[PDB]
Write a protein that binds this ligand. Structure first.
Ligand code: NI
Length: 92
């Protein structure tokens, strides 16, 4: 169930934030995200914002990292597109 990254598009907003395949997204701006729909819901709420901070769990790591996404070049159409894709992420 948990939101675990499978691939990361080169040069994407996630690639620049150093998010790596097999990383799990634990929170978006301190709001826990137990699944991908919860990630999607939080990201939609960042429309218009310059940045958001994600807390991630690298693969098989116990360490948790806060990573800042730069959203100043971000656009997606919320009726037609998956926000998770628009960040460079392919779910596992
Ligand atoms: Ni805002």
């Amino acid at each position: 169930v948990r939101p675990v990254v499978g691939e990361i598009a080169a040069n994407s907003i996630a690639a620049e934030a150093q998010i790596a395949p097999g990383t799990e997204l634990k929170a978006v701006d301190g709001i826990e995200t137990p699944d991908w729909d919860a990630v999607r819901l939080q990201m939609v709420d960042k429309i218009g914002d310059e940045s958001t901070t994600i807390t991630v769990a690298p693969f098989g790591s116990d360490q948790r990292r806060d990573v800042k996404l730069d959203l100043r070049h971000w656009a997606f159409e919320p009726d037609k597109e998956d926000p998770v894709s628009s960040l460079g992420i392919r779910p596992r």
